[PDB]
Ligand binder design. Structure first.
Ligand SMILES: Cc1ccc(NC(=O)c2ccc(CN3CCN(C)CC3)cc2)cc1Nc1nc(-c2nccc(N)n2)cs1
Ligand SMILES: Cc1ccc(NC(=O)c2ccc(CN3CCN(C)CC3)cc2)cc1Nc1nc(-c2nccc(N)n2)cs1
Ligand SMILES: Cc1ccc(NC(=O)c2ccc(CN3CCN(C)CC3)cc2)cc1Nc1nc(-c2nccc(N)n2)cs1
Ligand SMILES: Cc1ccc(NC(=O)c2ccc(CN3CCN(C)CC3)cc2)cc1Nc1nc(-c2nccc(N)n2)cs1
Ligand SMILES: O=c1ccn([C@@H]2O[C@H](COP(=O)(O)OP(=O)(O)O)[C@@H](O)[C@H]2O)c(=O)[nH]1
Ligand SMILES: O=c1ccn([C@@H]2O[C@H](COP(=O)(O)OP(=O)(O)O)[C@@H](O)[C@H]2O)c(=O)[nH]1
Ligand code: NA
Ligand code: NA
Lengths: 228, 228
């Protein structure tokens, strides 16, 4: 049975960097990058996603619903493709997701509703769609939360240097940070997925640069995986 | 095995009337009304759908994508519920769909793209979603096409007397009519569903009032069902 583990964290916490570290450490370890992340850098999904990203910069209250539905669809399709296609010869197969359908809804879509970028009907339609489109083989064995300060993530947005992201304000990162803490640390966020309240969570502090010094983080991962 | 038959036709051709006739004629015959039809007349789907219908009257180029995705989702959910819930004691089970996921895409969503109510990205995202969300137990054994003139349907819009529909112009009904003829009569419409080109189609002329005189139409249905 493939173990499914989500990597969760704020914008520029280090999730993509961490996932591309893990992928290389075992042939029994595979990764599903976040579609939105891949859109940001030829396929019709990439063409659609690049357009949606640009349209979102111009007016989020017009495109948030369209963006969030396509982002989540794209993720489910990509996660199921890896789950059905990969690790068939693995001894102890693990698939690492760069975020989940839960971060799609409870972090991003939720935040856009709160920022008045979706109206009540768009948010209620989104939740209905999400509740339904998520009815199975994608349920998580575990979550790894990469915890960074908003300041760390703001500095890492600067380092990554996507022109379109240099305008992201600290306040927005602080809001996303608070949502992550409520969901994954305090476990105060109510979701419509009962099993989630029971899913084991590994919290890793990634404030210190780990690109060349990640053995302690991977040790924590291997320990966490052995408990599942 | 439940036989799945779609009832296809223009606005106010008589599909709802015909489906509510059929339902009563056999305990082995069940119907899935079109969600959009039900929205037009307490549940969160009805609340969402009524809002989406009203928002669409005000500006279709804003709401067409949201409307078409929720309409099609709502249909898949309702068709699968009947397929999983009903006719378990039937000898020769038949489920009649009021329209299909194909009329959703090739008639309505297509028409809205053509009427510049969806941009290329919205239409390409819609088709991608549709291709994907349709990957199974809903494939049709047969189609029944209720063929009425645009003039007949315009007269039947008047008879049904939905205030919001009295503005529908003959030209729009003529466009929908042409799409139906290309798909179901000439079979000239290319779809992304190969099996559809092979699905048996029964064409019924419903220009004459059938509310109290429908035996000949039902005879054609029973004959058609015996060939499948
Ligand atoms: C690409 C892009 C472009 C622009 C914006 N912008 C805003 O988030 C935003 C919101 C609100 C506002 C203020 N108000 C003014 C007043 N208006 C009436 C209402 C908006 C200004 C700007 C975000 C992005 N990226 C995003 N990615 C995600 C996402 N990332 C991964 C997974 C996932 N599911 N979702 C979500 S959002
Ligand atoms: C530059 C700027 C300045 C202001 C605001 N505003 C709001 O986001 C916003 C928040 C909340 C509300 C309602 N609240 C507050 C006011 N009230 C006191 C209580 C209700 C109203 C408006 C957004 C921006 N731009 C932003 N860019 C992004 C972004 N850009 C690319 C990728 C990405 N993921 N995200 C996100 S935010
Ligand atoms: C409820 C409602 C309200 C309004 C409208 N309006 C328009 O169709 C419409 C379009 C185009 C125009 C002209 N232009 C001006 C210029 N603009 C730039 C761009 C629009 C004006 C009006 C349609 C509806 N109903 C509808 N139901 C369906 C449907 N029914 C069953 C299954 C299904 N999948 N889909 C589709 S559409
Ligand atoms: C009253 C009126 C008047 C005009 C138009 N216009 C167009 O629909 C339309 C068509 C096509 C195009 C591009 N074409 C043409 C122009 N060029 C010559 C070649 C490209 C541009 C615009 C729409 C309306 N209203 C309408 N109501 C509905 C409706 N209302 C409730 C439920 C429902 N299902 N449908 C449908 S249509
Ligand atoms: O320990 C780290 C983690 C990340 N980064 C840099 O910070 C930016 C954001 O990282 P990533 O793209 O992995 O963040 P994600 O958005 O995927 O969490 C990138 O330029 C990384 O190279 C770094 O220098 N050291
Ligand atoms: O043979 C018929 C078929 C329909 N109608 C009336 O025409 C309108 C449209 O019918 P329906 O709602 O069944 O059309 P649909 O949109 O479902 O095809 C309704 O007022 C029907 O009662 C009728 O008088 N005789
Ligand atoms: Na690997
Ligand atoms: Na019946």
């Amino acid at each position: 049975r493939i173990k499914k583990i989500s990597i969760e964290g704020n914008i520029a916490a280090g999730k993509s960097t961490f996932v591309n570290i893990l992928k290389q450490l075992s042939e029994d370890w595979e990764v599903v990058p976040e579609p939105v992340a891949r859109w940001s850098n030829l396929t019709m999904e990439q063409k659609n996603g690049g357009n949606v990203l640009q349209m979102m910069y111009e007016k989020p209250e017009r495109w948030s619903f369209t963006f969030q539905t396509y982002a989540c669809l794209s993720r489910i399709r990509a996660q199921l493709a890896s789950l059905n296609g990969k690790l068939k010869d693995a001894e102890k197969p693990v698939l690492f997701f760069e975020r989940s359908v839960y971060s799609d809804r409870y972090i991003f879509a939720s935040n856009l509703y709160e920022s008045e970028s979706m109206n009540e009907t768009e948010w209620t339609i989104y939740q209905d769609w999400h509740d339904w489109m998520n009815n199975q083989s994608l349920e998580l064995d575990g979550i790894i939360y990469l915890q960074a300060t908003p300041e760390t993530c703001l500095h890492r947005i600067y380092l990554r240097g996507r022109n379109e992201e240099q305008g992201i304000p600290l306040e927005y990162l602080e809001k996303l940070h608070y949502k992550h803490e409520s969901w994954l640390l305090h476990r105060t966020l109510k979701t419509n997925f009962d099993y989630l309240q029971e899913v084991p969570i590994l919290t890793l502090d990634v404030n210190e640069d780990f690109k060349d010094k990640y053995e302690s983080l991977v040790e924590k991962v291997k320990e966490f995986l052995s408990t599942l």
